[PDB]
Design a protein around this motif. Structure first.
Motif, short mmCIF file in Angstrom:
data_model
loop_
_atom_site.label_atom_id
_atom_site.label_comp_id
_atom_site.label_asym_id
_atom_site.label_seq_id
_atom_site.Cartn_x
_atom_site.Cartn_y
_atom_site.Cartn_z
N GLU A 68 -9.30 2.49 5.34
CA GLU A 68 -8.73 1.34 6.01
C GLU A 68 -8.16 1.69 7.38
O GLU A 68 -8.14 0.83 8.27
CB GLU A 68 -7.66 0.68 5.12
N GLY B 256 -6.77 -5.25 2.69
CA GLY B 256 -6.60 -6.54 2.07
C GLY B 256 -5.47 -7.38 2.60
O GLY B 256 -5.28 -8.50 2.12
N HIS B 257 -4.74 -6.88 3.61
CA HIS B 257 -3.62 -7.62 4.16
C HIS B 257 -4.09 -8.94 4.75
O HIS B 257 -5.26 -9.12 5.12
CB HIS B 257 -2.92 -6.80 5.24
N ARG C 148 -16.35 -3.64 -0.62
CA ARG C 148 -15.36 -4.70 -0.74
C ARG C 148 -15.11 -5.32 0.62
O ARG C 148 -14.99 -4.60 1.62
CB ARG C 148 -14.03 -4.17 -1.32
#
Ligand SMILES: N=C(N)NC[C@@H](O)CC(=O)C(=O)O
Ligand SMILES: [Cl-]
Lengths: 369, 353
Positions: free
Chosen positions: A9, A22-23, A346
């Motif tokens: 990330e 995922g924020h 993802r």
């Protein structure tokens, strides 16, 4: 060279087409912008009021928003942490005082596994089918000191239904096991809005729940992890908490209160419709791409797994990055068997639709050689 | 009221209130710009403000943490695989001892006169894997001078020992504004520095700890950092940048004058009381030790609490020998002068009865 998902990330944080972490990074709604515009008023409030009152209002607003009416509202039963991972570090170091082994849902967000292992806990994976579909075995329960469930799970969105939470908490009570829940994704799926604290208290097991405000709203990572524990938890979470921090900023608690109230006034329904829309654009874009499928058809969470035949997620990731699109390979969510995730990536859905659309059109081309 | 915890709770200056009034603009900046640019600017502003020109400015070398105690948890966990024993300055901030001990490290105290006044013994250095120094120290304000830092770093290099510094109080004392990173890099020991923005300014505990490490540190600080967080809020980094810029424009001088004024208030209030002394006459830090013969700091603490005044007894800071501190209390100076004066007036009355 990327030792964990967070290190994948880092590579995306400064890119326009970050669909990795995922924020929440979509635009503020008009109601949320009104909160931001009032930040100087909230600052003055935070200077003038006791932090305990602001904290109590923030907790009441967040728990009630998400159906958790039975949360323990007495001061000190909910410990506000800088983040859910800080809560998890506290829990893991606390567990290590009296527990040797933890049963942990597999796959799940990898830093749960890494913080537990880093604090000396041996991990036993529990696949999702086993966790949801059947009682845990007496052999397993007698060999672990804690069962840890992420619900809704990250990355799969799978929600532990009330009847299974009830049975699991009864099993943990019968064996003296700690039941620990990570509920970061709670706000995304109404199936997780039945009252978990009522279930846990009725069953009478030792329990810990880590709530997280951080994933729901685009608050520039201004957030809290909320470490909630049963009175009989019998772990030193309060002492270790106090070794790490005095508390969180009153301004962040005020923000959580205001964002929670906006969510209760219609913001949460709008968020669900927004995530549903973005999930739909992803699935529509990767429609008849030969070899593509979606492993979690019923997920309502803010992240989306995509599977492919014939290539690995690492290879897909690399061809994506050459176009300055950053997704996340799935291997490392499968913290006990990374090859289980070798053919998935993802995608983050808490993104403005236009850069999300652009990113998945790029993925469509890649995935078509 | 509260003169216990060391956090900054005085009113904002006019320049700082202007920053707060512009929070909606800082929010828009944080949505629009790459966090790495905001972070580099925050680090540059803060390190340069405090004289630390040699800090490693390459992305990834300064790890922004939610707090200095989170940085310390990372450091303590990172030490625990390879280090059994840590030499730690005594007294100091007791959280450091509790985080080290809680992660399995055994502690060896080093008294301040020994740490500053002479080289450390080969016996001590060959028996510990890390030497940890808080400078300026909390609670004493004592500053590790450049010549002693250089020798300590050279000795740690000679013995294969990690030198770790906690520099949370750096901004308060210009004696700590010589370039520590130049010294560390020139000595070539394995080193870690934990900077803290939190104690300087009244930012409602919006802050970061900055975990800085040598390229050869040989500890899993980066890995364990990444297990705990992706990074800090860009808004907080922008706030640090702006408060640092205000400080550079004259705000830091105003802060030093404010702390000096509040230190003067405390000492003038207690000057004449029988049995009272000030162990740290040259401290410029935002906390003040008060020594008094005839009573224990615990007894004085108890009495103040009856009058709704909350200070701290000093026992806890003497983490290896708590009785070393039971004739002292500590007073927080990062407070509006009026409630501080009210608190010290109660203390004076208590000490005169
Ligand atoms: N070690 C941490 N805390 N990494 C950041 C975390 O927010 C990432 C995550 O959970 C996701 O991308 O879904
Ligand atoms: Cl303090």
């Amino acid at each position: 060279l990327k030792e964990n998902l967070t290190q994948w990330e880092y590579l995306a944080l400064n890119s326009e087409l970050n669909i990795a972490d995922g924020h929440a990074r979509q635009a503020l709604s008009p109601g949320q912008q009104k909160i931001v515009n009032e930040l100087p008023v909230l600052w003055a409030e935070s200077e003038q009021r006791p932090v305990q009152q602001i904290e109590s209002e923030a907790h009441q607003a967040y728990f009630t928003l998400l159906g958790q009416h039975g949360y323990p509202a007495e001061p000190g039963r909910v410990l506000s942490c800088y983040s859910s991972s800080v809560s998890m570090e506290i829990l893991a170091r606390s567990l290590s005082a009296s527990v040797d082994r933890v049963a942990l849902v597999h796959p799940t967000f990898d830093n749960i596994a890494d913080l537990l292992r880093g604090n000396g806990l041996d991990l036993v994976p529990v696949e999702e089918d086993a966790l949801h579909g059947a009682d845990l075995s007496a052999e397993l329960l007698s060999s672990v000191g804690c069962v840890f469930v992420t619900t809704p799970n990250n990355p799969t969105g799978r929600v532990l239904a009330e009847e299974r939470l009830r049975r699991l908490a009864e099993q943990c009570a019968e064996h003296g096991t700690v039941l620990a829940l990570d509920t970061s994704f709670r706000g995304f799926d109404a199936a997780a809005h039945y009252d978990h604290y009522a279930v846990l208290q009725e069953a009478g097991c030792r329990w810990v729940v880590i709530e997280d405000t951080g994933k729901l709203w685009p608050t520039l990572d201004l957030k809290a992890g909320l470490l909630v524990f049963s009175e009989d938890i019998g772990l030193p979470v309060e002492k270790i908490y106090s070794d790490i921090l005095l508390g969180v900023s009153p301004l962040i608690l005020a923000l959580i209160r205001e964002f929670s109230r906006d969510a209760a006034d219609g913001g949460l329904a709008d968020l669900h419709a927004f995530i549903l829309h973005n999930r739909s654009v992803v699935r529509r874009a990767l429609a008849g791409v030969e070899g593509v499928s979606f492993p979690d058809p019923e997920s309502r969470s803010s992240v989306e797994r995509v599977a492919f035949a014939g290539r690995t997620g690492t290879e897909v990731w690399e061809e994506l990055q050459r176009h300055h699109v950053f997704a996340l390979p799935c291997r490392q969510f499968h913290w006990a068997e990374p090859s289980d995730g070798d053919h998935m990536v993802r995608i983050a859905l808490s993104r403005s639709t236009e850069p999300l659309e652009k990113s998945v059109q790029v993925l469509r081309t890649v995935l078509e050689t």
